[PDB]
């Protein structure tokens, strides 16, 4: 659709001036709808160093209804290609402001990941297979997501020369 | 008078006292850009805050550059 | 699922593997003979061109004496998914049902009401772009999406992505 | 020339048409080789409906081409 297109043109180019920290996000060139987005794990959170790959399914009638929310690395916190019952906390839960950016969707999808809070979709694990999981992510995407590599081609030549580097010490 | 990074981007500054209510400060965020309280969330050098506190329980000096993130929640 | 109608349904099954109908591949569930599924190919000269629509055919238990109830799990913009769809040879017409009719005459009324633009319970008003945008993300709706579509055609889901990456090259 | 037509019931008929032959003058044959409500009833190929005025030239219905027959329920 004319609108959403343009709009959600426009919100990449604002990602690609000024990405969010941690999180990497681009449309699919074949979908404007679905964005592909990679979420570094910080540093005090049990996912540091983990790669997860996720998508946000924006719908038909954008701007008009959130996006639909799927993790797709296997992380310990959400269950992978599961969609996540993400609400906005007022009077009337079916409530969406048309004029939230993509960069501010993912950093909440962050800020949620990052916290205990539970949901249609969060699973519940200990912190050592929080951490395992973010260690192989980078071999996951790599070899086990077929929709990393076509999305992401370059990552995937990132993760390569990484995981060399990571035989050394 | 402290600051919070919006979620535009913009940074906006806050008459405020440590003795004021966090909700109180997302009251005033309201006043400056529209997002009711419910729908916010602040963090502080990587932790986030709570309603029922106020500014001196997280010992936030004046001045300071806030992160304010969507909130968002679930059930 | 009575003896009668196993009999029937396999009998049907039989019919429609030696002389499938056109642009329509369709085949029960391995564990209930009542649920079929199918897939219909977007026939030319329609705005659904190359379009892969994942389907349901629900039969009841005293089958072939009640119609079964149609569904279209795949969004394609003609109907709205996981709803019972008014056809003439659908669970909307009891009275009017025909023991005698095949299964390839119900699926192939439910393709040529497709291609048409009349008006039914179940169907939906949309663009053309919007049906020829949702023809194009089918395939990956099917693949990635799509639970049942992964459990009853699991070749499918391999011709799927091997489409996909050549796409992508 | 000769084309097929796959009734309801899943049988298998031969017409004598000509590409002249409207799918009006088809579906009125078909009443001829069997007792047809041929309002009640439309023709398909290539996946879609087949208007009763237009011709099987205009359709590009060549030879040995098999037409099915779907049911016309009109009151919705």
Known sequence: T????????????????????????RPNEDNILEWHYIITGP???????????????????????????????????????????????????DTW??????????????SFMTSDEATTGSITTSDHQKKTLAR?????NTFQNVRFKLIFPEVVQENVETLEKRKLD | ????????????????????????????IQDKEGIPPDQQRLIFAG????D???????????ESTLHLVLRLRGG
């Open chain 1, 97 to 110: 402001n048309p004029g939230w950016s993509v960069s501010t969707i993912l950093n909440g999808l962050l």
């Open chain 1, 43 to 93: 540093a005090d959170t049990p996912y540091k160093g983990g790669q997860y790959h996720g998508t946000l399914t924006f719908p038909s009638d954008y701007p008009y209804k959130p996006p639909a929310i799927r993790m797709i690395t296997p992380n310990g916190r959400f269950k992978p290609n599961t969609r996540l019952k993400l609400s906005m906390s007022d009077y009337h839960p």
């Open chain 1, 136 to 140: 192989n992510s980078i071999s996951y």
């Open chain 2, 52 to 62: 029922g506190r106020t500014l001196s329980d997280y010992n936030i000096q004046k």
């Open chain 1, 2 to 25: 004319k609108q959403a297109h343009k709009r959600l043109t426009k919100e990449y180019k604002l990602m690609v001036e000024n990405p969010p920290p941690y999180i990497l996000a």
């Open chain 2, 47 to 50: 932790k986030q805050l709570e």
């Open chain 2, 1 to 28: 008078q402290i600051f919070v990074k919006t979620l535009t981007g913009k940074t906006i500054t806050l008459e405020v006292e440590s003795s004021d209510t966090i909700d109180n400060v997302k009251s005033k």
